[PDB]
């Protein structure tokens, strides 16, 4: 009943456990299960949810076809339990949108999705289930935010949004929400030269965000707010451990205040623990597409551009499809450290599977652990030709 | 726990928001969500809810065979989470019938069901979810009700009714009930000729409906009550910019105490916000055929017989399907105004669309917003070619 | 959190309004609904539900096949939402047989299911859901009970059972329950000559159970259970309006200590309110088969061995199918008097319906009104050659 | 809100009475049903569950085929209403993982959930719905757990692990949980030569657990934890009534501390109470498979090595498939002792009836009575031929 603070530190990091798999595509194939993409995880004080955009059809359904496109009219932000499937007759529609956000202060919570045609979009920011303020594109081409959990400290939830060119300077801000209200925004400052589709945590009063440069960078552009001052700070994860997708072959220097070349106008939406030498990242096993998914320990990934991995933990075998991966935490566990968890988007259907009409995903999702446990891998599983 | 107060005026309205939209005919197509018509929204006081008239039959089902049909006995009042679809497993009965109103009173909800022949109806009214009062039919010809949300005010719930021919003279009465008992009922007054499916909304102690002459009128009738004093009055709405469907091309000057001429015996139930320059009109953009829906701001459109529109907003394109719209509010919201908010009720099926059986819909809704936000346009969304 | 007890008189019955209905073969065509039969409806303080024996099959299930079958391992007392379906998805177990009654006493409920083979059935007595006595059939033949729910005062709620032939003399039992635990049972007294499947009621202090004499009545068997002494009598409805079904065509004078003669060995649940003047009979329109369903106000029906109908209202028109019928009130309700209500089970399939391999039914439920309001008719309303 | 402790003795079982049958191959032919297997039972303070390890996929999915396969990535440990069916919308996951535990404390409930390749498998414990502590294989060789559920005494849960080979020596560890956390640890100790699938059961502040000897032994070992000393001893059941399966026909004199010979590595989990003279086995009829399930009262089973059967009950005739089979007690329950319980998994598919490809189960439980009731047989019931 207090809006809760990020008083504590991450807990040490020592290996990954299992925790959630909802296997919606195989459950799907004869289920009402919705067609979803962009799905997350979030936690309330008493439960913890998966979320995703619905695009607003069963799979089995014959308006499946076509799911591939991005911004419909007939999507929204859904939730529902924790590892149950996106169900017609579970999921529970937090707001309608193609683009979201959303995070419990302690008291209840936020959620923002963005609709609208590419020149006029807009978000509407809800509160305690009930729509509170409104924000109108300002740069008129496809205004959008996280993809993934926001993070609250004190009553503040920053939140980061884009609109403008995917392939070019665009125009991000960073929103300090209370109460559904906007407190402040800022313009990004900072280094990072591209922002898109920030995966966020919060911990000893800090929230970081680890975003995609969709223009220019293979390294990740990194946010670091501070939701007292309502102030921020942006540049690249320095590591020559490049974690966007596709990607050039790793180098042995990374670039700290620029955007690593190679590879232009792409990218995949995902996440780091950056806490000095408790630094794990997640990337895609392939360089090329989004295949395969692994964790790695990189001590001091965000600040020594040389820093390479001391250990790991495959998550998705690389001849098994990825997708988008996001931060998130249940900021009212017990105990007296915060554990970072994340999930991968098992991506199903096109463009990669094109024998199908339609494109979904399924959610694995992992918490560190302080033991150093044996690693199994955790594909989607299911049979594509029993789709024909 | 105490009954609610109107005791709020409206927002200021310069744009409207997408509020909740369930993608009901899509979703049915492949899985078990229920043939329904005449839906509508309703807030209790922590939670907002969609309503809307059961068929008794899935979509897919053998029985959706004959749903054009609008009183049978297989009909009831049904209520589902916000933008869920209306499904076998999650649809609430509230009450059975195939005429329906209900409304929060602050304490608990008010659910009225009519059912029967035509020349013997009755309404049943459900206080707490249990049946209190019964009322016979007084003119023996389809006893009916709003189709969407009453309004209540210190306990006081006001009701309109209409019983007697759709297309002549009737018997008009507005009840006014409390705790599901009857304190008092009036025969319509004021100067409107036919009274159908009023739409109603409350702010500063009074309430305002926006109903349908079927009889003779393509400028819509309002009925204003003093839900204190229990007194009414009626006339139409003066403006120019004529909103019922069918209806004749606008004229420079319309009519404030009489039918404005040009169609008879139809009609659509549609609603307004009447709030001096504050003022929206919705309307089928057609002016023959329920398709397309848009706002239209015109300022003081109730009483300024030359009134034109200042701004206005599509909500749905003329090639797309349209049908009954009505308002609610959420009056347990923060903030110091009510935020006004309608529903569009997307028809499929009979009769414009016979290659099906069938008829149904899904609902698209939304609420004003302070900014002046970017449209988009919100189609049902199914493809008909589907079910065949 | 007290015991209910019963202070109030039946509420004046001068017309019967549409309560609840379930449409359950509609639906059940294309969505997942259980193959029940003899169902019955029975309110907690809170809520008031459906209740019914599954067969632990879909309808259209292939293990639907052979479900005209009365006891099989395969059933269970299952209760549902008040007008939804009973459906796999929302339909709770109470315990499991292929004989129940339930009720509230206040405080939380009792449910009993009777099972096992013919010669060795046994009772298990559920109280605040879990199971509390156990009862060892005592004439080794069908122990058995009666399929509407019972009716508690001060907490002692009095069971009617029955064990031993169906078609000769058997020995019926009144068991006293009080937190599901035994206080005392009595065997059958009075002048009813064979008891099956009560119908009950309470009001002022005092419990009457319509009930079913299946060896040789055509007049129905009635007993009146005094729940603080622990007493009863027995008794036949005095009235020459014959009940039972089938039946022999109404004389002019019953009889009140003996079976009305005419038709052996078979019948059908039914049920009525006794109360003076205000006395309502339900009964089966046809004479030889279970189809149509009316009430008639026969004052006085109990005593008077002359009484005939003064007033009446169809519910369901011979040319649709009924079938088991009993009583419930809803003992929490507001107000100075309890309301009258029954439920009619509308049987579909076998035997009267063979195109089809299964028996099912849905409900229709009303309670009394103190208006004279219109009568409509409420068929099953499902078409058997969907289903083919 | 205190941790419940041990404080009563067992009832007195005379004979046993139905508690829950989900019915749920039956059901699951038409509507969407999860694939199981190692179901069990477990009780909250105000509600008990059916439990089971999900497969991932529902009955009809084309992904069923190759469900008889133990440990995939698709399995999660899932709980649901007593008697309803593991459906997709109505089953909560507790964890993910192939072998699992679960028990409530009083408090709220641990769950235990073991993941990973045969080599490098890892347990994962969850408290209050969230994860706490994780323990990594110490044998490498398919850690494992009970397959039912664990048992509290103020606080401390108890629960028996197996890693290493199923054929041969391994390492058992009893490890004793309070709220998630690890108090301590032990290795088996005693007699017992070999430990899989423990069913326990506490009373009078002693837990008593009956594993399978999957190496040599036919009749069971049983391993007895002092929750508050947090020791334990082990030994089989002295009994010449042999409970595993397969086995050797009954000797005249059994085994207290060694493995009764005849057959060697397979078995099957199943449970006992051994209480003195109050003493039951269950056991399947067939000596060579799992057909058919009976209880044996056989007093002092545990001590007495010509202890034969005094009473008996046949749960499940021989001419149907039965299953696992393990103990659970709703320990907050009224009155002065606690109700013995027990489960039947009955295995419907492979290996058994190939004709179809997948292997699923629906569950059968029963808790003791006072009275000598009488007996009925409660197969799965359904029909094979259908799903073909
Ligand atoms: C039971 O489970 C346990 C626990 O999970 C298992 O033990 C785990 O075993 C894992 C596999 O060996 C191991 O993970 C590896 O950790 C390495 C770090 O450890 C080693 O180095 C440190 C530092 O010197 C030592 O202290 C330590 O002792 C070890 O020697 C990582 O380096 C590993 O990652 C690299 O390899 C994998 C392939 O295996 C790549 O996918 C990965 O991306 C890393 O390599 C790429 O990137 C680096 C960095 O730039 C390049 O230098 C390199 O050339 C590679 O680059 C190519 O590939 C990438 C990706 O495609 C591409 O982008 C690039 O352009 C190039 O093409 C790996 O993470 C766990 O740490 C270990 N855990 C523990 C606690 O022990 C145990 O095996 C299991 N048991 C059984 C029996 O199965
Ligand atoms: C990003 O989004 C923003 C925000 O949504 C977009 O901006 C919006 O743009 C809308 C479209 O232009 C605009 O809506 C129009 O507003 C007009 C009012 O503004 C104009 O007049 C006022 C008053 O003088 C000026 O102050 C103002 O500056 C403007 O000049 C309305 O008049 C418009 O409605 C009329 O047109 C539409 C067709 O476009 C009809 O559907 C509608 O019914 C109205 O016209 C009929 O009715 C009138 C009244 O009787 C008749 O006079 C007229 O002849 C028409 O009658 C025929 O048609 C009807 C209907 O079929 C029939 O019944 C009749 O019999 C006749 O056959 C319209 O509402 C928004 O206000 C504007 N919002 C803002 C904040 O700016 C922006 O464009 C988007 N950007 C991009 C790049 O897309
Ligand atoms: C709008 O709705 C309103 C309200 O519902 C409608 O008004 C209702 O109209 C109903 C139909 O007319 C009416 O119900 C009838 O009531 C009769 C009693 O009233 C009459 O008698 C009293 C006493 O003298 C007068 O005071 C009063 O003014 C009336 O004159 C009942 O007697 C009626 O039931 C009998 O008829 C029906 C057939 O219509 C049978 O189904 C029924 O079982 C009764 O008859 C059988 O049983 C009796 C008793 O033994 C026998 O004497 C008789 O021969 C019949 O027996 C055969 O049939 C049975 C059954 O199959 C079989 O077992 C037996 O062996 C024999 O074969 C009937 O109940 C409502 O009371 C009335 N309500 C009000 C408030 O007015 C209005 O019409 C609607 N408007 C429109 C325009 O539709
Ligand atoms: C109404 O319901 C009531 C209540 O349920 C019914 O009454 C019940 O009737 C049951 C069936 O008769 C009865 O159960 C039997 O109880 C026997 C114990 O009672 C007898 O012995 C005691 C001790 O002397 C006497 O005091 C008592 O009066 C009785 O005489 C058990 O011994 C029975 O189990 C044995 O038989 C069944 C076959 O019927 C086997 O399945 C079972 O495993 C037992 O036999 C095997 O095991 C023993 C022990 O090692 C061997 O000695 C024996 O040779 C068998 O071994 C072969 O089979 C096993 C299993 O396949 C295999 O492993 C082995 O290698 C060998 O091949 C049985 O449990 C209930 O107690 C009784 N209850 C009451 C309260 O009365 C009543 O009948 C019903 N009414 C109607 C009309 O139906
Ligand atoms: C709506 O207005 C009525 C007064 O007109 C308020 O009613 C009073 O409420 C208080 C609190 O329960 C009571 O002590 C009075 O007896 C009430 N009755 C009247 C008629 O005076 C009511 O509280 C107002 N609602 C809210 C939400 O404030
Ligand atoms: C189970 O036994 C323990 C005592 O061994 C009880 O614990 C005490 O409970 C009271 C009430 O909360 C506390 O004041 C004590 O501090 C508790 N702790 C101990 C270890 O003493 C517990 O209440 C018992 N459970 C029940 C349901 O009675
Ligand atoms: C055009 C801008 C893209 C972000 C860099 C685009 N975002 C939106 C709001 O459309 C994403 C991108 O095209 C898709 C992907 O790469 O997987 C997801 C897609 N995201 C969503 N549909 N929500
Ligand atoms: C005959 C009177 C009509 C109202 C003016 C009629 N109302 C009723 C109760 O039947 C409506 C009208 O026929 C249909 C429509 O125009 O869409 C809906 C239909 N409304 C409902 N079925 N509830
Ligand atoms: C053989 C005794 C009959 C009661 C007089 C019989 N009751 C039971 C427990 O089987 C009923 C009768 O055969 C069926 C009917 O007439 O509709 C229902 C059937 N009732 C139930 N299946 N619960
Ligand atoms: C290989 C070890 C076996 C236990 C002795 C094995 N356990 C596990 C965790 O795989 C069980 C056994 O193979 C199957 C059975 O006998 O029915 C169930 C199977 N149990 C589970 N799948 N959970
Ligand atoms: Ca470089
Ligand atoms: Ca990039
Ligand atoms: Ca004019
Ligand atoms: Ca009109
Ligand atoms: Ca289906
Ligand atoms: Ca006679
Ligand atoms: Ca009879
Ligand atoms: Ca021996
Ligand atoms: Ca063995």
Redesign the interface.
């Given at each position: 009943r207090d809006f809760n603070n990020l008083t504590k530190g991450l807990c040490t990091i020592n290996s990954w456990?299992?925790?959630?798999?909802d296997?919606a595509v195989?459950?799907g194939?004869?289920?009402?299960?919705?067609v979803t993409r962009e799905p997350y995880v979030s936690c309330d004080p008493d439960?913890?949810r998966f979320y995703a955009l619905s695009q607003?059809?069963?799979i089995?359904?014959?308006?499946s076809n076509g799911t591939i496109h991005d911004r419909?009219?007939?999507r929204?932000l859904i939730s529902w339990?924790?590892?149950?499937?996106p169900?017609?007759?579970?999921?529970?529609?937090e707001?309608?949108?193609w683009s979201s956000t959303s995070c419990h202060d302690g008291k209840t919570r936020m959620s923002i999705?963005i609709?609208?045609?590419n020149?006029?979009?807009?978000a509407?920011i809800w509160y305690?289930?009930?729509?509170?303020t409104?924000?109108?594109?300002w740069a008129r081409n496809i205004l959008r935010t996280q993809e993934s959990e926001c993070v609250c400290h004190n009553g503040v939830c920053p939140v980061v949004f884009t609109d403008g060119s995917a392939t070019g300077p665009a125009e991000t801000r960073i929103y300090y929400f209370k109460?559904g209200k906007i407190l402040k925004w800022e313009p990004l400052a900072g280094t990072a030269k591209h922002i898109e589709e920030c995966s966020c945590y919060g911990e000893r009063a800090e929230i970081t965000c680890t975003c995609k440069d969709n223009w220019q960078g293979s390294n990740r552009p990194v946010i670091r707010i501070d939701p007292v001052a309502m102030t921020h700070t942006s540049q690249y994860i320095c590591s020559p451990v490049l974690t966007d997708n596709p990607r050039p072959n790793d180098p042995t220097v990374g670039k700290c205040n620029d955007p690593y070349p190679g590879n232009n106008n792409n990218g995949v939406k995902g996440f780091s623990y950056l806490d000095g030498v408790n630094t794990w990242l997640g990337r895609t096993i392939s360089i090329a597409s989004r295949s395969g998914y692994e964790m790695l320990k990189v001590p001091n990934a965000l600040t020594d551009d040389k820093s390479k991995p001391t250990q790991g933990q495959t998550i998705v075998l690389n001849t098994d499809w990825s997708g988008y991966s996001g931060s998130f935490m249940?900021y009212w566990?017990?105990?007296e450290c915060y554990?970072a968890c994340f999930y991968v988007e098992l991506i199903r259907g096109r463009p990669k599977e094109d024998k199908v009409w339609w494109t979904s995903n399924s959610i694995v999702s992992m918490?560190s652990?302080?033991?150093?446990?044996?690693?199994?891998?955790?594909?989607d599983?299911?049979?594509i030709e029993?789709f024909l």
């Open positions: 456990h299992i925790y959630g798999k296997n195989r459950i194939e004869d289920s009402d299960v919705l439960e913890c607003g059809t069963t089995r359904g014959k308006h419909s009219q007939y929204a339990p924790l590892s149950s499937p169900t017609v007759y579970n999921s529970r529609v707001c309608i949108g999705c609709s609208g045609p020149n006029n979009a807009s509407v305690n289930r009930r729509p509170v409104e924000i109108n594109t109460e249940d566990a017990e105990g554990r918490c652990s302080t033991e150093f446990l044996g690693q199994w891998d955790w594909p599983g299911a049979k029993y």
